[PDB]
Amino acid sequence: MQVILLDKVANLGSLGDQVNVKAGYARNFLVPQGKAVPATKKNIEFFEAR
Amino acid sequence: SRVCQVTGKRPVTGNNRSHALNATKRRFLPNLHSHRFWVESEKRFVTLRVSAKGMRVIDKKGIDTVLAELRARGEKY
RNA sequence: GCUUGACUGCGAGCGUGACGGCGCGAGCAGGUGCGAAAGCAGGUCAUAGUGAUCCGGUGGUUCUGAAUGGAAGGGCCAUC
RNA sequence: UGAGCCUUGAUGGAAGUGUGGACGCCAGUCUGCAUGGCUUUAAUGUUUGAUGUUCUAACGUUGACCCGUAAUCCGGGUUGCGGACAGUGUCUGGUGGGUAGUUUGACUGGGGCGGUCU
RNA sequence: GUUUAUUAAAAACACAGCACUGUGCAAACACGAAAGUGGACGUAUACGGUGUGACGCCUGCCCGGUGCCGGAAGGUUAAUU
RNA sequence: UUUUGUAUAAUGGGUCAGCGACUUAUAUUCUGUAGCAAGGUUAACCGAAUAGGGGAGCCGAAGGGAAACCGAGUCUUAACUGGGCGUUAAGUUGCAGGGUAUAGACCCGAAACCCGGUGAUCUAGCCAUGGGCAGGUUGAAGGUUGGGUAACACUAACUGGAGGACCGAACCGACUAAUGUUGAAAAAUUAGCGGAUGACUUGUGGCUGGGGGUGAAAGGCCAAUCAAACCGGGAGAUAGCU
RNA sequence: AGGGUGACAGCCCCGUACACAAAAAUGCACAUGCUGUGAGCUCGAUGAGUAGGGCGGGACACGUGGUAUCCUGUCUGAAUA
RNA sequence: UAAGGUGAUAUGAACCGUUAUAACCGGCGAUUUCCGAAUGGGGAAACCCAGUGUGUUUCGACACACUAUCAUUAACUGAAUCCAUAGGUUAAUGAGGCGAACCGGGGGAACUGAAACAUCUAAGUACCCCGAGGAAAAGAAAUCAACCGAGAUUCCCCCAG
Ligand SMILES: [Mg+2]
Ligand SMILES: [Mg+2]
Ligand SMILES: [Mg+2]
Ligand SMILES: [Mg+2]
Ligand SMILES: [Mg+2]
Ligand SMILES: [Mg+2]
Ligand SMILES: [Mg+2]
Ligand SMILES: [Mg+2]
Ligand SMILES: [Mg+2]
Ligand SMILES: [Mg+2]
Ligand SMILES: [Mg+2]
Ligand SMILES: [Mg+2]
Ligand SMILES: [Mg+2]
Ligand SMILES: [Mg+2]
Ligand SMILES: [Mg+2]
Ligand SMILES: [Mg+2]
Ligand SMILES: [Mg+2]
Ligand SMILES: [Mg+2]
Ligand SMILES: [Mg+2]
Ligand SMILES: [Mg+2]
Ligand SMILES: [Mg+2]
Ligand SMILES: [Mg+2]
Ligand SMILES: [Mg+2]
Ligand SMILES: [Mg+2]
Secondary structure, three states, X not given: OOOEEOOOOHHHOOOOOEOOOOHHHHHXXXXXXXXXXXXXXXXXXXXXXX | OOOOOOOOOOOEEEOOOOOOOOOOOEEEOOOEOOEEEEOOOOXXXXXXXXXXXXXXXXXXXXXXXXXXXXXXXXXXO
């Protein structure tokens, strides 16, 4: 569960980095709260074009 | 029923075995939980009775796919 | 007094057991001790001092080695 | 607050005024304070345990209100409470006549008790 | 008062009274793989369990054993790593 | 029949008739017999279907050694004067029979264990809704009025009508006896007996299920069955016993 | 073949061998109509919470045994010609 | 197809037929009360009661038809919440129940054997359950082989107790 960010956020905030977050942190808060999204190897290209 | 809506995991029967190998019937049943999942693609939460792994699948494949299944298969949800 | 025959491989022929087994044994081969030598010694004057098989340990062993080389595992010999 | 690599520690403008500490068997008129032609003595960034506080966002709610709905079921919703606990799955040490399956020798001047068993 | 319908009606069981003990409520506890239900539309003057058995006068010593309650030290100790 | 031994007063049989217990299949070995012979024979299958085809294969002609391997020898040991097992006699396939193996394996018989069902029309307890208790006693609290107290206390009458209270029918029980015991009855009859406004008794209907129910507790009751109900099943359980 | 007929029937009866028969409805084959369906060439693509592993069981003749292999309740988790 | 028929116990009555509408046999139709999956609601099976539609030169009350549930699809409707969902009505399809074995799947005993008994056996048997077909299942190598080769699955005989 690496995911890519969206806004700032915690000791990793950056509007679009590849972090390595704990899954529960990921698929219970950030994504449902729209602060990140999974890095599904398709996603590692849209925020790897900027 | 204790069936994982994602994997179809259900209880399975096996044995106990003592140090003397006495067999006593028993069941392994799955690590169910039931969990509010955000879809966004429907602006709603859906509670699936899900196994861990069921979760780990949803993590990987991603919800909507999994939801294509279930619906593809007829699961209520 | 000197010593390691309480030796290794074998064993004509016998005794004794329902059987598993146990016992006695000259002699042959190799190597050894004591004796000047003929000789004697394969434990103790003899008859009690004991535990099948299985499972497993150890040492040895080119005997076996699931395509082939090895290895695991097995066998055999010794022993627990 | 345990512990590695990066990091805040060390290694294969001269000389003047010169004063506590050094695991220093058993106390260096020597160095710095303003000025002068790829580590133990411990601590900033981390990947990682133990404990304690705080938070909400999984999870609980056999509080309250709302709708389905004239419904003490269920669900959805709002909210208060609880909160990474509780509970559950797999694994695991303890306990476990609550429950189950069984064992508990033979001889013998009946059997038991005694004695005996090579 | 109750009991062995059909060889035992009693000194047995029950009883009110007594004591210990559990239980803060989503109670302990019981039926139940579970949902749930009883306990109770009760809440410690309540409820379960256990022993004793109206009343009167009373109920002494022993915690070494077994059990239970308490015990943030230390020794030994599972999966795991 | 069983026994050391039975007229035995030890078993079994009232009598007759019918039925009633060593089978079947597949393996293996021996005997007989048949075929062929250092060879014998095919299995499935094909099939002009008991033929014919099919020799996959099985047995035998070589043994010894754990084995590699060697071979009329081989193993043992450094090696046998040796020793162990072998070298000399024929095998094989049918058919009939004797044994054995696997099967219910000669026939009948348990007490039980497991599985799925059917039972609270009896009885136990509980839930709901309806019914019953002739007649006669006792006289609790309370009340009233006099007496009595400073007022209460207290006291006498009268009134009142309490109780798992009293005597006693219906009703509910079941202490004694006799009768009955192939009964009138698989628990009653007769004479006595207990309770009889209560933890009473009763009609209807409901709920609880088998290691489960229910139990004022006897292991009681759960349909004349109870230290684990009944029906069907595993099932021909197993029976070193009769 | 067989049955029947007053007892045992090739020739009494009903059959049997043999040869024939379908107005209608149907099984089965083909042949087409209608519906639904896709064929073909070029260039591509090649099955991840999976394989494997840890724990627990189960399957493989194989009882964990030196035990390959298969399945998975549980926690994990690749390479990609 | 036909000279005889109106099933049997089963006579009798009254009939019907003989050259083709007697009977009898076959194909296809028609009718087909009530209960039963039972399906309009209920229910002590074969009974009680409805809503709505139809129906009467005697247009009342009765008779008939339809109205179960679930699934899929559509349409129309439509909360908390405006969107949107859940919810609700209608409609079209299909399902439901029964049935001998064979078949695949979810569960799964004990007696018994071991001369006792735990491992082991009985045995993945008996039994319960779900599902399907005319057969089921299995199947087009991440299979064997052993350096030579074979070439999906299934069944039979060997290999071999
Ligand atoms: Mg290999
Ligand atoms: Mg026991
Ligand atoms: Mg037993
Ligand atoms: Mg004895
Ligand atoms: Mg009695
Ligand atoms: Mg009595
Ligand atoms: Mg108390
Ligand atoms: Mg007493
Ligand atoms: Mg006698
Ligand atoms: Mg005799
Ligand atoms: Mg005589
Ligand atoms: Mg006589
Ligand atoms: Mg006699
Ligand atoms: Mg009753
Ligand atoms: Mg009385
Ligand atoms: Mg009386
Ligand atoms: Mg009875
Ligand atoms: Mg029997
Ligand atoms: Mg049996
Ligand atoms: Mg592929
Ligand atoms: Mg009806
Ligand atoms: Mg109905
Ligand atoms: Mg036994
Ligand atoms: Mg090749």
